[PDB]
Design a protein around this ligand. Structure first.
Ligand SMILES: [Mg+2]
Ligand SMILES: [Mg+2]
Length: 342
DNA sequence: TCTAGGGTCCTAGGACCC
DNA sequence: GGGTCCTAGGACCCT
């Protein structure tokens, strides 16, 4: 009953699309990200820029210190959504068992496939090709018996490559696998685990489940499972969107309510336009606001509300402003909607 | 160098329900 | 005391 799971992951997705559409960008360092003047960060970069140390989520001022000739791009999201829709349709030629995890990646369960003699390796290869055909972008892939190993595997032969982990290969692979490689083990978790002497899945294998449960709750059960290759999560294919948000970081912190209210006036029409694409009648479960202060503490206040409404968002932002600001500057204002359950 | 914007999921206290 | 809803915060994911 061993399953075949593929994780397909586009290479330097946003940047790859910009280079296809502007070949002048191919061999110089480029990045999609907000300018230093907009206090932006890097969304992604191409390999010429990564050579200098440019990475996703890095402050753009830092990316420019590392790479002074970096070419900053604003982003063409409809072009990325178009490429996303296209690779998802390519996935559909092979199976309906597709769980997209973001624009540029997905899990596929090809256990019950008989497309390439049932070879998940050859299916992944055929998918990466033809994606390169048809779209002129490259993808990488991982093949494993469970989700998280497949997702780790797709990173190991990036770019334009793939990696296959068989059941017989799982124990040696786990033994020295850093815990931070596990999707969902982030910086904070890895430091907590490091400070108790737990760096790798092999370290966690020597641990008692009861101890992991005491110290990490349900997450400790995830750690215990993942450190043994155990990951029973099914490829879904029926996941639905649950929220939509629109937020903006200003170039300068704002200090007056009038400024905050003016930001909301520009944010609201965008939130409405995006909700209306998915819920034309604007009916929702909750709506609310977000403020982030100059000390980077952030607060949200949100409440049951039946239908997108600008004045209530302004009013709610006003309360948040007056009540939780305590004289600090505000760097970000955000609007938010929680979608109805079905 | 100085910190985005799009999201999902988990936790947790009091309210409310029984 | 036990479910479940409401709400806020935070870790983490993607580019
Ligand atoms: Mg990618
Ligand atoms: Mg990806």
């Amino acid at each position: 009953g061993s399953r075949k799971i593929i994780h397909v992951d586009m290479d330097c997705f946003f940047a790859a699309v910009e280079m296809r559409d502007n070949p002048a960008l191919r061999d110089i360092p480029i990045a999609i990200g907000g300018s230093r003047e907009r206090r932006g960060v890097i969304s992604t970069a191409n390999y010429p820029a990564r050579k200098f140390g440019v990475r996703s989520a890095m402050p753009t001022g830092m990316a420019l210190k590392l790479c002074p000739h970096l070419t900053l791009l604003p982003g063409r999201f409809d072009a990325y959504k178009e490429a996303s829709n296209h690779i998802r349709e390519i996935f559909s030629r092979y199976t309906s068992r597709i769980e997209p995890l973001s624009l540029d990646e997905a899990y596929l369960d090809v256990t019950d496939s008989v497309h390439c003699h049932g070879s998940a390796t050859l299916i992944a290869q055929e998918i990466r090709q033809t994606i390169f055909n048809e779209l002129q972008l490259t993808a990488s892939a991982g093949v494993a018996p469970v989700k998280f190993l497949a997702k780790i595997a797709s990173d190991m032969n990036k770019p334009n490559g793939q990696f296959v982990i068989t059941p017989a290969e799982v124990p040696a692979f786990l033994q020295t696998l850093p815990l931070a490689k596990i999707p969902g083990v982030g910086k904070v978790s890895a430091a907590k685990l490091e400070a108790m002497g737990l760096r790798t899945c092999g370290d966690v294998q020597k641990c008692d489940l009861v101890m992991l449960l005491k110290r990490f709750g349900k997450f400790g059960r995830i750690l215990w499972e993942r450190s043994q290759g155990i990951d029973e999560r099914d490829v879904n294919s029926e996941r639905l969107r649950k929220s939509v948000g629109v937020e903006r970081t200003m170039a300068e912190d704002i200090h007056h309510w009038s400024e905050c209210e003016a930001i909301i006036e520009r944010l609201y029409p965008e939130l409405e336009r995006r909700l209306a694409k998915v819920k034309p009648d604007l009916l929702i479960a909750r709506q609310g606001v977000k403020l982030k202060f100059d000390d980077f503490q952030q607060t949200t206040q949100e409440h049951v509300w039946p239908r997108l409404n600008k004045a209530d968002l302004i009013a709610t932002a006003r309360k948040t402003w007056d009540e939780r600001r305590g004289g600090r500057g505000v760097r970000l204002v955000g609007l938010h909607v929680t979608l109805l359950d079905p």
